[PDB]
Write an enzyme that holds these catalytic residues in place. Structure first.
Site, PDB file in Angstrom:
ATOM      1  N   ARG A  19      65.371 -24.643  21.408  1.00  0.00           N
ATOM      2  CA  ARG A  19      65.183 -23.229  21.104  1.00  0.00           C
ATOM      3  C   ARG A  19      66.128 -22.763  20.009  1.00  0.00           C
ATOM      4  O   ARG A  19      65.771 -21.891  19.208  1.00  0.00           O
ATOM      5  CB  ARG A  19      65.395 -22.382  22.361  1.00  0.00           C
ATOM      6  CG  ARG A  19      64.361 -22.601  23.454  1.00  0.00           C
ATOM      7  CD  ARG A  19      64.164 -21.331  24.283  1.00  0.00           C
ATOM      8  NE  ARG A  19      63.081 -20.497  23.757  1.00  0.00           N
ATOM      9  CZ  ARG A  19      63.213 -19.216  23.416  1.00  0.00           C
ATOM     10  NH1 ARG A  19      64.389 -18.612  23.539  1.00  0.00           N
ATOM     11  NH2 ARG A  19      62.169 -18.538  22.950  1.00  0.00           N
ATOM     12  N   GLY A  50      64.411 -31.193  26.513  1.00  0.00           N
ATOM     13  CA  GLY A  50      65.595 -30.894  27.290  1.00  0.00           C
ATOM     14  C   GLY A  50      66.859 -31.564  26.799  1.00  0.00           C
ATOM     15  O   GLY A  50      67.757 -31.840  27.608  1.00  0.00           O
ATOM     16  N   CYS A 106      62.341 -36.935  34.400  1.00  0.00           N
ATOM     17  CA  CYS A 106      63.322 -36.815  35.461  1.00  0.00           C
ATOM     18  C   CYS A 106      62.994 -35.589  36.306  1.00  0.00           C
ATOM     19  O   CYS A 106      62.780 -34.493  35.769  1.00  0.00           O
ATOM     20  CB  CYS A 106      64.723 -36.722  34.863  1.00  0.00           C
ATOM     21  SG  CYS A 106      66.037 -36.530  36.057  1.00  0.00           S
ATOM     22  N   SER A 125      71.773 -24.505  17.046  1.00  0.00           N
ATOM     23  CA  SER A 125      73.224 -24.392  17.164  1.00  0.00           C
ATOM     24  C   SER A 125      73.731 -24.961  18.481  1.00  0.00           C
ATOM     25  O   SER A 125      74.938 -25.190  18.620  1.00  0.00           O
ATOM     26  CB  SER A 125      73.673 -22.935  17.044  1.00  0.00           C
ATOM     27  OG  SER A 125      73.152 -22.158  18.103  1.00  0.00           O
ATOM     28  N   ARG A 126      72.839 -25.182  19.446  1.00  0.00           N
ATOM     29  CA  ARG A 126      73.195 -25.745  20.741  1.00  0.00           C
ATOM     30  C   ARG A 126      73.335 -27.262  20.704  1.00  0.00           C
ATOM     31  O   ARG A 126      73.772 -27.855  21.696  1.00  0.00           O
ATOM     32  CB  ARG A 126      72.150 -25.323  21.777  1.00  0.00           C
ATOM     33  CG  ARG A 126      72.140 -23.810  22.020  1.00  0.00           C
ATOM     34  CD  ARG A 126      71.094 -23.374  23.037  1.00  0.00           C
ATOM     35  NE  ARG A 126      71.297 -23.988  24.343  1.00  0.00           N
ATOM     36  CZ  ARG A 126      70.493 -24.915  24.846  1.00  0.00           C
ATOM     37  NH1 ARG A 126      69.439 -25.315  24.144  1.00  0.00           N
ATOM     38  NH2 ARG A 126      70.733 -25.436  26.045  1.00  0.00           N
ATOM     39  N   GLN A 136      72.920 -31.167  30.224  1.00  0.00           N
ATOM     40  CA  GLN A 136      74.029 -32.104  30.396  1.00  0.00           C
ATOM     41  C   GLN A 136      73.553 -33.553  30.286  1.00  0.00           C
ATOM     42  O   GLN A 136      74.178 -34.372  29.600  1.00  0.00           O
ATOM     43  CB  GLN A 136      74.754 -31.853  31.735  1.00  0.00           C
ATOM     44  CG  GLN A 136      74.004 -32.326  32.995  1.00  0.00           C
ATOM     45  CD  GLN A 136      74.800 -32.193  34.296  1.00  0.00           C
ATOM     46  OE1 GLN A 136      74.461 -31.382  35.158  1.00  0.00           O
ATOM     47  NE2 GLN A 136      75.850 -32.999  34.445  1.00  0.00           N
ATOM     48  N   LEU A 192      63.552 -31.725  31.451  1.00  0.00           N
ATOM     49  CA  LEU A 192      63.430 -30.283  31.586  1.00  0.00           C
ATOM     50  C   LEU A 192      64.117 -29.805  32.855  1.00  0.00           C
ATOM     51  O   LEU A 192      64.153 -30.501  33.875  1.00  0.00           O
ATOM     52  CB  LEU A 192      61.961 -29.863  31.611  1.00  0.00           C
ATOM     53  CG  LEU A 192      61.175 -30.115  30.327  1.00  0.00           C
ATOM     54  CD1 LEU A 192      59.714 -29.769  30.544  1.00  0.00           C
ATOM     55  CD2 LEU A 192      61.764 -29.335  29.151  1.00  0.00           C
ATOM     56  N   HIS A 252      59.162 -29.133  40.491  1.00  0.00           N
ATOM     57  CA  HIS A 252      59.357 -30.561  40.249  1.00  0.00           C
ATOM     58  C   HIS A 252      58.191 -31.366  40.806  1.00  0.00           C
ATOM     59  O   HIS A 252      57.678 -32.286  40.155  1.00  0.00           O
ATOM     60  CB  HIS A 252      60.662 -31.025  40.889  1.00  0.00           C
ATOM     61  CG  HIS A 252      61.858 -30.853  40.015  1.00  0.00           C
ATOM     62  ND1 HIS A 252      63.129 -30.683  40.522  1.00  0.00           N
ATOM     63  CD2 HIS A 252      61.985 -30.844  38.668  1.00  0.00           C
ATOM     64  CE1 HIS A 252      63.987 -30.568  39.525  1.00  0.00           C
ATOM     65  NE2 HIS A 252      63.320 -30.665  38.389  1.00  0.00           N
ATOM     66  N   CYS A 267      64.129 -47.652  30.553  1.00  0.00           N
ATOM     67  CA  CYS A 267      62.716 -47.560  30.909  1.00  0.00           C
ATOM     68  C   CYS A 267      61.800 -47.678  29.696  1.00  0.00           C
ATOM     69  O   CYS A 267      60.606 -47.966  29.857  1.00  0.00           O
ATOM     70  CB  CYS A 267      62.443 -46.241  31.636  1.00  0.00           C
ATOM     71  SG  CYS A 267      63.122 -46.174  33.302  1.00  0.00           S
TER      72      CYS A 267
HETATM   73  N1  LIG Z   1      72.120 -31.141  38.655  1.00  0.00           N
HETATM   74  C1  LIG Z   1      71.788 -32.267  39.541  1.00  0.00           C
HETATM   75  O1  LIG Z   1      72.636 -32.759  40.225  1.00  0.00           O
HETATM   76  C2  LIG Z   1      70.387 -32.809  39.582  1.00  0.00           C
HETATM   77  C3  LIG Z   1      70.056 -33.720  40.521  1.00  0.00           C
HETATM   78  C4  LIG Z   1      68.798 -34.215  40.563  1.00  0.00           C
HETATM   79  C5  LIG Z   1      67.857 -33.778  39.632  1.00  0.00           C
HETATM   80  N2  LIG Z   1      68.177 -32.863  38.678  1.00  0.00           N
HETATM   81  C6  LIG Z   1      67.163 -32.430  37.722  1.00  0.00           C
HETATM   82  O2  LIG Z   1      67.202 -33.296  36.356  1.00  0.00           O
HETATM   83  C7  LIG Z   1      66.671 -32.544  35.404  1.00  0.00           C
HETATM   84  C8  LIG Z   1      67.599 -32.532  34.161  1.00  0.00           C
HETATM   85  O3  LIG Z   1      68.947 -32.521  34.594  1.00  0.00           O
HETATM   86  P1  LIG Z   1      70.012 -31.425  33.945  1.00  0.00           P
HETATM   87  O4  LIG Z   1      70.948 -30.958  35.006  1.00  0.00           O
HETATM   88  O5  LIG Z   1      70.790 -32.099  32.865  1.00  0.00           O
HETATM   89  O6  LIG Z   1      69.187 -30.121  33.322  1.00  0.00           O
HETATM   90  P2  LIG Z   1      69.874 -28.810  32.491  1.00  0.00           P
HETATM   91  O7  LIG Z   1      71.385 -29.033  32.284  1.00  0.00           O
HETATM   92  O8  LIG Z   1      69.653 -27.506  33.298  1.00  0.00           O
HETATM   93  O9  LIG Z   1      69.119 -28.677  31.008  1.00  0.00           O
HETATM   94  C9  LIG Z   1      67.994 -27.843  30.877  1.00  0.00           C
HETATM   95  C10 LIG Z   1      67.157 -28.310  29.656  1.00  0.00           C
HETATM   96  O10 LIG Z   1      65.897 -28.004  29.833  1.00  0.00           O
HETATM   97  C11 LIG Z   1      65.365 -27.275  28.488  1.00  0.00           C
HETATM   98  N3  LIG Z   1      64.444 -26.238  28.821  1.00  0.00           N
HETATM   99  C12 LIG Z   1      64.288 -25.439  29.881  1.00  0.00           C
HETATM  100  N4  LIG Z   1      63.232 -24.617  29.639  1.00  0.00           N
HETATM  101  C13 LIG Z   1      62.743 -24.918  28.416  1.00  0.00           C
HETATM  102  C14 LIG Z   1      61.682 -24.390  27.688  1.00  0.00           C
HETATM  103  N5  LIG Z   1      60.735 -23.369  27.934  1.00  0.00           N
HETATM  104  N6  LIG Z   1      61.398 -24.874  26.472  1.00  0.00           N
HETATM  105  C15 LIG Z   1      62.138 -25.878  25.945  1.00  0.00           C
HETATM  106  N7  LIG Z   1      63.185 -26.401  26.663  1.00  0.00           N
HETATM  107  C16 LIG Z   1      63.480 -25.912  27.900  1.00  0.00           C
HETATM  108  C17 LIG Z   1      66.419 -26.727  27.920  1.00  0.00           C
HETATM  109  O11 LIG Z   1      66.270 -26.714  26.420  1.00  0.00           O
HETATM  110  P3  LIG Z   1      66.739 -25.314  25.623  1.00  0.00           P
HETATM  111  O12 LIG Z   1      68.018 -24.842  26.256  1.00  0.00           O
HETATM  112  O13 LIG Z   1      66.951 -25.591  24.127  1.00  0.00           O
HETATM  113  O14 LIG Z   1      65.710 -24.235  25.793  1.00  0.00           O
HETATM  114  C18 LIG Z   1      67.628 -27.567  28.372  1.00  0.00           C
HETATM  115  O15 LIG Z   1      67.979 -28.458  27.422  1.00  0.00           O
HETATM  116  C19 LIG Z   1      66.564 -31.132  35.984  1.00  0.00           C
HETATM  117  O16 LIG Z   1      65.268 -30.795  36.172  1.00  0.00           O
HETATM  118  C20 LIG Z   1      67.330 -31.200  37.340  1.00  0.00           C
HETATM  119  O17 LIG Z   1      66.740 -30.270  38.327  1.00  0.00           O
HETATM  120  C21 LIG Z   1      69.435 -32.370  38.644  1.00  0.00           C
END
Ligand SMILES: NC(=O)c1ccc[n+]([C@@H]2O[C@H](COP(=O)([O-])OP(=O)(O)OC[C@H]3O[C@@H](n4cnc5c(N)ncnc54)[C@H](OP(=O)(O)O)[C@@H]3O)[C@@H](O)[C@H]2O)c1
Ligand SMILES: NC(=O)c1ccc[n+]([C@@H]2O[C@H](COP(=O)([O-])OP(=O)(O)OC[C@H]3O[C@@H](n4cnc5c(N)ncnc54)[C@H](OP(=O)(O)O)[C@@H]3O)[C@@H](O)[C@H]2O)c1
Ligand SMILES: CC1(C)CCC(C)(C)c2cc(NC(=O)c3ccc(C(=O)O)cc3)ccc21
Lengths: 207, 206
Positions: B35, B10, B109, B38-39, B14, B75, B132, B188
């Site tokens: 995936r 992941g 996470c 370029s990202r 962000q 993830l 989750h 950690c």
């Molecule tokens: N937004 C909030 O305020 C908040 C609060 C509490 C908890 N969280 C949780 O913390 C976690 C991470 O935070 P985030 O907001 O930074 O997540 P995010 O921005 O949505 O990033 C998603 C990441 O997960 C990867 N991913 C998803 N499916 C994949 C797959 N099949 N294979 C490989 N990679 C995959 C993606 O890699 P690729 O794009 O290269 O495929 C991407 O880098 C999340 O689960 C979120 O629910 C978020």
């Protein structure tokens, strides 16, 4: 003379939306509204120029509403429902994508003055709705659009005055804004760039 | 422990992007599974190794976990509105690969929703929150040394390194910067004290 003339209003059937709509029509705007239920628009009240019946949670409906506009006003909310919700943040996500696809830059969107608070001091009963205001403000701030973040205190039923205070990037000196003055301010933000990228707290002492 | 090589899953989200940047700056040898490369940013701190693939292919996951000292799991599928198993299926692949290659430490996470009454979860987020929970149980049942990171709102405030960490419960504040969150995931890796615990990083940003 129409620099900004066509606007979309989301949440136009709500407490603030209805008076924002009335004021906008009187001011000469060509208004498009997205409404879930056409019956929520007053049969005797002022009519928008265009009605889209649909849901802010459908990207297709938001796209149809944003197409061809000069700017967007957002007054989404959950009425008095305090339940956990994502309708405002997910709606803002769809609005952002639609604005980018249609070349609309200006969005004036209402969250809440609690976003200027110590987050631990928000009343527990309001925390779920405030949580989605926080999510929504993050969506709009990260969009890169010309975003005015309107963060009001209590919305009351006092008159339209046009005489309220606008506090930039902090809490203001009063704890109320009338729904009519809040709508007046949303429309005022269409005529100026001075609040773009800022948080604004409108408030007034009605006397 | 002596963690030098880590895999980040992941890394293009962000939180992952700043965790990756901070990990590279600190001197970790980072492998990422993406995936589309370029990202990843063309400039600044870049990872040492890039595997092109995704977490649902056990082979890509094995290739990413091989040779590592620890795993960071960031993830997300919060696009998903209805039942989804991408995260928990990914964690199953990650757990299998760590066991096959002798990797013992995973920092993953999820969300502070896992520390609230379930009625706190907005209806359209219940599917992602349900997965989750499934991912958390896959990792709790792992027998691997697992730090569960369960953050509240993730903000964009600058890095401070001054947040608080609450153990097995919610803390005083309700926000964590994405930069402080990445900082904590890396912390950690340098200690045992959070293993087998849930952790809630939070801070008040002046
Ligand atoms: N937004 C909030 O305020 C908040 C609060 C509490 C908890 N969280 C949780 O913390 C976690 C991470 O935070 P985030 O907001 O930074 O997540 P995010 O921005 O949505 O990033 C998603 C990441 O997960 C990867 N991913 C998803 N499916 C994949 C797959 N099949 N294979 C490989 N990679 C995959 C993606 O890699 P690729 O794009 O290269 O495929 C991407 O880098 C999340 O689960 C979120 O629910 C978020
Ligand atoms: N003192 C206060 O009341 C106060 C103080 C600070 C901040 N705020 C916040 O200010 C904002 C506006 O408050 P308000 O009282 O003027 O609004 P409101 O009366 O709650 O009206 C909300 C508007 O959003 C529409 N809406 C809700 N879900 C929708 C959906 N899926 N699709 C399309 N439209 C949808 C509603 O349509 P329907 O007519 O179909 O329901 C309605 O028109 C809210 O976000 C509120 O939380 C209020
Ligand atoms: C969820 C909803 C719509 C339910 C109805 C009430 C309960 C009316 C409500 C009230 C607020 N906030 C305020 O009223 C307020 C007043 C003063 C300040 C301040 O002094 O900064 C900040 C906020 C925010 C949301 C809501």
């Amino acid at each position: 003379h129409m620099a900004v003339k066509k606007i979309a209003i989301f949440g136009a059937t709500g407490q603030t939306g209805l008076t924002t709509l009335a004021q906008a029509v009187q001011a000469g705007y060509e208004v498009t509204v997205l409404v879930r239920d056409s019956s929520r628009l007053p049969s005797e009240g002022p009519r928008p120029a265009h009605v889209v019946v649909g849901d802010v949670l459908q990207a297709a409906d938001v796209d149809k509403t944003v197409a061809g506009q000069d700017a967007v006003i957002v007054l989404l909310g959950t009425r008095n429902d305090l339940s956990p919700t994502t309708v405002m943040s997910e709606g803002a996500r769809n609005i952002v994508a639609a604005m980018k696809a249609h070349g609309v830059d200006k969005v004036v969107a209402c969250t809440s003055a609690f976003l200027l608070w110590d987050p631990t001091k928000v009343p527990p009963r309001l925390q779920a709705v405030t949580d989605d205001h926080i999510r929504m403000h993050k969506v709009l701030r990260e969009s890169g659009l010309k975003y005015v973040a309107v963060m009001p205190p209590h919305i009351g039923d006092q008159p339209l005055t046009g005489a309220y205070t606008v506090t930039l990037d902090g809490r203001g000196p009063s704890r109320v804004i009338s729904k009519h003055d809040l709508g007046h301010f949303m429309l005022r933000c269409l005529t100026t760039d001075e609040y773009d990228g800022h948080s604004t707290y409108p408030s007034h002492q009605y006397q």
